[PDB]
């Protein structure tokens, strides 16, 4: 091509990028990549706010699990099926909310906000380390707990050149398939020794010992990229180029006026501005008194500084990379800036929705992907334990049937009304013409028919005991 | 001075060797946990 | 018959080393302590300082 060579007469002739694969490119500086970018996420208030829509929206306050397991693959009763998925339902509600936090070790954590710790380490860091253990305390009925562990925990031992199957704390195979980990112990304080340990990622009898979640961009990516790394230096400099504008606004505005009378300084103030009326260096303070208005002789002259308007363009620059860096982090302006302005409700739906679009998809490709994880690593402790009955009739085992009998997802959530009304008539609209189902719109709304039925039938037969009214179902 | 000079080949010929002695005889690797290091045999004789 | 490794035993080695630093250290300030509540007078001085 034209482009591709050099450019439109030299142009980019000095630019040659280093064609290089993934690992190459984020490798020799993973460590102060990541440092960077969790600096800019601690420090600054717009990606704050950024990770902040993103544990928030990603997941929201609730994460309800929904499960169906694959009965016609099983040869399973649809009925059979369906009676140990209400089992294993109640025993997840029994067990992941439960208010001991003993869930996960630390005891600090409940299951919906160690989802959300994990996808904001995936958003901010590029990556998600989760482990699973069996505890030997015989105090609990379930003996699994789990721990998030941050990427700057797992490292290549010495830091030295990184080698072909080691890949900076990772073992590949020959397919490059990744089967173990180096963990670190915690750094702090760093200055007592600092010690490694290999880790499996899968237990060698099927169960997952440790759980590794991230978007690989390109084969062989051992390691993911936060989205940060396209725009930490075009926010630095923001934040850097706002802290300035704030001090030269300060800076312009303490000054105001300017004596330029030839006596002394103290003789001038007192003959000019005022002050004096000393009790008994620190210059003069002036008395703050109302209008007053000096006399002056030939070599005398009081100038009030003009200064300068203080925002000269700067609010709209900086309106302008706060667009560029929305781009980069996929999220709307609005929400991002606090700026609703001038907007067309058409526009602003338009953004939302391709915002909630962007969103929904994340929580599909690792919330998803991370819960179905630990909730197969509590289902294999659940069924050996045999809580819960698997049926007798099973074509396969657990063994081999881990991802038939763990085919569960979960809602966040829901897409929250922009209007409320117009939802509501779509919904309505779409089950009165059979074009949803009562599923559909209950996950949208972030609800389950299930429970909700179970609560229609109660409330009912509630009214029914009152004498109060039969409500709009009946018969 | 006017001299582009464009480059198409970047030819080593550097060197020309192959051990082939750490798979002949020495298969089998064993680094130290210690500094000593002993090694034995047994010799077969009689009268 | 059991002997472990020298990273290991590096790693004891520092440990042993950290503990008698600390040592070190807080006998110098029982030192100061039963200078100070014993005549209250009380010079701090040595080669180099």
């Known amino acids: ?475 | 001075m006017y001299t582009t000079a464009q480059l198409l080949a970047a030819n080593e010929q550097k060197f020309k060797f192959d051990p082939l002695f750490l798979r002949l005889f020495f298969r089998e690797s064993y680094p130290f946990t210690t500094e000593k290091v002993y090694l034995s045999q047994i010799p077969g004789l009689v009268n | 018959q059991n002997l472990a490794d020298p990273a290991y035993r590096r790693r004891r080695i520092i440990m042993q080393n950290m503990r008698d630093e600390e040592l070190a250290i807080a006998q110098v300030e029982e030192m100061q302590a039963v200078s100070a509540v014993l005549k209250g007078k009380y010079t701090m001085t040595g080669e180099a300082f």
Not at chain 1, 76 to 82: D, L, M, S, V
Not at chain 1, 109 to 121: D, L, N, S
Not at chain 1, 177 to 192: C, F, I, K, Q, R
Not at chain 1, 322 to 333: D, E, N, T
């Open chain 1, 1 to 475: 091509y034209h482009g591709g060579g050099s450019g439109f007469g030299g142009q980019l002739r000095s630019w040659n990028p280093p064609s290089e694969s993934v690992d190459a490119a984020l490798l020799p500086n993973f460590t102060r990549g990541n440092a960077r970018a969790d600096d800019l996420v601690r420090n600054n208030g717009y990606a704050a706010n950024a990770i902040q829509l993103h544990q928030d929206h990603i997941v929201g306050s609730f994460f309800r699990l929904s499960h169906r397991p694959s009965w016609r693959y099983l040869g399973i009763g649809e009925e059979e099926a369906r009676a140990f998925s209400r089992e294993v339902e109640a025993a997840w509600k029994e067990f992941a909310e439960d208010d001991c936090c003993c869930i996960d070790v630390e005891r600090k954590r409940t299951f919906t906000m160690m989802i959300r710790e994990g996808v904001a380490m995936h958003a901010f860091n590029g990556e998600l380390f989760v482990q699973a253990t069996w505890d030997t305390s015989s105090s609990r009925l379930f003996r699994t707990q789990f721990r998030m562990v941050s990427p700057k925990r797992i490292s290549n031992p010495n830091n030295t050149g990184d080698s072909r199957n080691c890949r900076a704390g990772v073992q590949i195979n020959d397919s490059g398939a990744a089967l173990g980990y180096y963990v670190s112990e915690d750094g702090y304080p760093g200055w007592m020794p600092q010690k490694w340990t290999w880790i499996p990622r899968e237990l060698p009898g099927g169960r997952a010992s440790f759980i590794h979640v991230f978007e690989p961009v390109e084969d062989g990516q051992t390691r993911g990229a936060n989205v940060f790394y396209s725009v930490m230096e075009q926010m630095k400099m923001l934040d850097t180029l706002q802290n300035t504008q704030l001090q030269s606004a300060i800076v312009k505005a303490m000054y105001a006026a300017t004596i330029e009378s030839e006596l002394d300084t103290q003789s001038a103030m007192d003959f000019i501005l005022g002050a004096n009326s000393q009790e008994q260096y620190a210059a003069a303070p002036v008395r703050l008194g109302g209008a007053k208005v000096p006399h002056l002789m030939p070599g005398d002259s009081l100038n009030l500084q003009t200064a300068q308007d203080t925002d000269n363009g700067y609010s709209v620059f900086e309106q302008s990379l706060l667009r560029y860096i929305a781009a980069g982090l996929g999220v709307s302006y609005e929400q991002l800036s606090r700026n609703y302005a001038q907007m067309s409700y058409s526009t602003a739906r338009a953004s939302a929705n391709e915002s909630w679009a962007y969103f929904m998809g994340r929580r599909k490709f690792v919330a998803s992907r991370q819960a179905s994880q630990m909730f197969l690593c509590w289902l294999e402790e659940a069924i050996v334990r045999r809580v819960v009955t698997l049926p007798s009739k099973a074509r396969f085992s657990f063994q081999e049937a881990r991802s038939a009998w763990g085919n569960c997802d979960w809602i966040g959530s829901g897409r929250m009304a922009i209007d409320g009304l117009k939802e509501v008539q779509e919904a309505v609209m779409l089950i009165e013409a059979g074009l949803s189902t009562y599923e559909k719109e209950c996950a949208k709304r972030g609800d389950d028919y299930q429970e909700i039925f179970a609560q229609q039938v109660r409330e009912t037969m509630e009214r029914r005991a009152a004498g109060l009214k039969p409500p709009a179902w009946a018969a």
